[PDB]
């Protein structure tokens, strides 16, 4: 005969609200949001929000108790604490007039604007969250989508320029992996941009790139959680790239020189050396893309399926073939305009896209410039 209270037992132990979770974790709201954005804790639903707490509202969010218990027992809490202490030390050095001690403390801080590397060490969290590689590919879908957009996004205070350059370099190394291994299968372009579907180890990955254009970020957007997504997915894509390059035997990281990339090499800047149906499409043909065409996506598609020689204009980039139109070596030239060499064949990028989609070499006469183009299809 023991009297037990209804409030203290049942769903009250199982779910804890947001306010009590932050109070028990004893952190600030943005730092708790960073910890949840890294651990992947999602608020779920209780079966009865009435049985959790007495003062309850449907707008309020709950959390799993064992998720909070996992949240407490992390090495990153001590990292939050001594990094905030180091911010106190660098502010002390700035207020004390010691420039050299300030330089030493900011060297020790590893602050992610002069480096481009993620601020914290995220090896163990991504090890515990992803036990194997196909889950890493499944989240690499969204990770690589985020990174391609971010490489085409500008820089602000919350998103500096150096890790944007690292986004660019890492995405380009991934593209070099795809054009080496021919892992890309499907490519569909649109008013979003271009979606690409590639198979890796029997797993499909879909990822979207917008066009080379000014994107407005008007409205109410938070850029700090953007930066958290950034450093998370630099960690994931760097480790995925290293694993995949070790799987294929290619050395990582492959070298790139600053001179030709500062001349605009783009995909030709990175050199890859082998030791430390896709191939039959464009096996031995000659490709040139003109000054109007988007250079990055068609170069990605052409190199992805083993086309041997693709060239472009001198102002579109550096590190290509001869830019003269009078050269008789080029057979297909991609143009979209409102020369006329007889041996050279004038085609449009819709012809390239339908040849890639159908794998049946849709004809250049039906996709000739100066005429209304017959429609294509989305093969998904």
């Amino acid at each position: 005969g023991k009297a037990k209270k209804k409030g203290k037992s049942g769903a009250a132990r199982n779910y804890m609200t947001r306010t009590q979770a932050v109070k028990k974790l004893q952190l600030s709201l943005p730092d708790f949001r960073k910890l949840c954005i890294w651990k992947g804790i999602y608020p779920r639903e209780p079966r009865d929000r009435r049985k959790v707490n007495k003062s309850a509202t449907a707008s309020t969010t709950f959390y799993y108790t064992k998720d909070i218990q996992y949240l407490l027992h992390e090495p990153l809490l001590q990292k939050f604490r001594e990094q905030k202490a180091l911010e106190k030390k660098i502010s002390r050095a700035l207020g004390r007039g010691d420039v050299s001690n300030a330089a030493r403390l900011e060297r020790n801080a590893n602050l992610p604007e002069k480096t481009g590397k993620p601020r914290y060490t995220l090896n163990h969290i991504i090890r515990e969250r992803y036990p194997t590689f196909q889950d890493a590919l499944r989240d690499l879908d969204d990770c690589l989508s985020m990174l391609f957009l971010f490489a085409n996004l500008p820089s602000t205070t919350a998103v500096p320029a150096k890790m944007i350059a690292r986004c660019e370099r890492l995405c380009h190394e991934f593209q070099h992996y795809l054009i080496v291994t021919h892992s890309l299968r499907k490519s569909f372009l649109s008013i979003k941009g271009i979606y690409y579907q590639a198979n890796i180890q029997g797993e499909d990955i879909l990822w979207l790139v917008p066009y080379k254009f000014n994107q407005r970020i008007v409205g109410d957007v938070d850029f700090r959680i953007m930066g958290t997504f950034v450093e998370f997915y630099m960690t994931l894509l760097g480790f995925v790239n290293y694993r995949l390059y070790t799987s294929i035997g290619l050395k990582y990281p492959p070298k790139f020189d600053q001179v030709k990339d500062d001349q605009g090499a783009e995909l030709a800047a990175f050199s890859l050396e082998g030791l430390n149906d896709p191939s039959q499409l464009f096996a031995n043909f000659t490709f040139f893309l003109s000054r109007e065409t988007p250079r990055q996506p068609l170069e990605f598609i052409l190199r992805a399926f083993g086309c041997k020689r693709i060239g472009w204009d001198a102002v579109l980039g550096e590190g290509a073939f001869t830019t003269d139109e009078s050269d008789p070596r080029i057979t297909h030239q991609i143009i979209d305009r409102p020369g006329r060499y007889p041996g050279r064949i004038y085609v449009q990028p819709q012809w390239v896209w339908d040849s890639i989609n159908d794998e049946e070499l849709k004809p250049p006469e039906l996709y000739a410039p100066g005429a209304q183009l017959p429609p294509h299809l989305s093969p998904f």
Partner: protein, 185 residues
């Protein structure tokens, strides 16, 4: 009404007691402190002549060690430490003396203005022992002194000395002898 904590009340009542009693002249002279501009000029010179931190000292010593593995003049710094500065004043080596105004055992510095007056060294009372501390890379510093400098700013030091002896010493000259505080009125 509401109740204040005890140590806050002790702090404020120590304020009122130290400002509204009949303070002796040796302690009442410390309420007259340098202005903002003259303290800024003096701290510009003393920031030119700061000592080295631990990191710079070990870095320099490592440099000499590897230079020996593979010529100097006397260093000129701001002199600090109470007994050291008192010894410098007594031997007439100090050129300018800056005394903090909030030394909690104030006996450690009450004789210092009179000592500087007797030996003839120009002195000034500054706001903050923590300010003098930042200059010498310590938490606090009861007193600092400058004795001699490099050539390229000797004139500047001289002007600064003249500045205090025209800008602080004669404004203090009559009120350095009088008792302070009181509730007359």
């Amino acid at each position: 009404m509401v109740k204040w904590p005890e140590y806050i009340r002790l702090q404020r009542q120590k304020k009122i007691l130290r400002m509204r009693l009949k303070v002796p002249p040796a302690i009442a002279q410390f309420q007259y402190t340098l202005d903002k501009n003259l303290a800024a000029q003096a701290f510009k010179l003393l920031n030119k002549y700061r000592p080295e931190t631990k990191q710079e000292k070990k870095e320099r010593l490592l440099r000499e060690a590897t230079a020996i593995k593979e010529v100097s003049k006397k260093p000129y710094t701001v002199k600090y430490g109470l007994n050291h500065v008192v010894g410098l004043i007594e031997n007439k080596k100090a050129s300018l003396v800056l005394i903090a105004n909030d030394v909690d055992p104030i006996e450690l510095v009450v004789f210092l203005p009179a000592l500087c007056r007797k030996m003839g060294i120009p002195y000034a009372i500054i706001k903050g022992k923590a300010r003098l501390g930042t200059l010498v890379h310590k938490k606090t510093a009861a007193v600092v002194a400058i004795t001699e400098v490099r050539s390229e700013d000797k004139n500047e030091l001289a002007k600064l000395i003249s500045a205090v002896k025209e800008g602080y010493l004669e404004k203090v000259e009559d009120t350095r002898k009088r008792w302070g505080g009181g509730i007359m009125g």
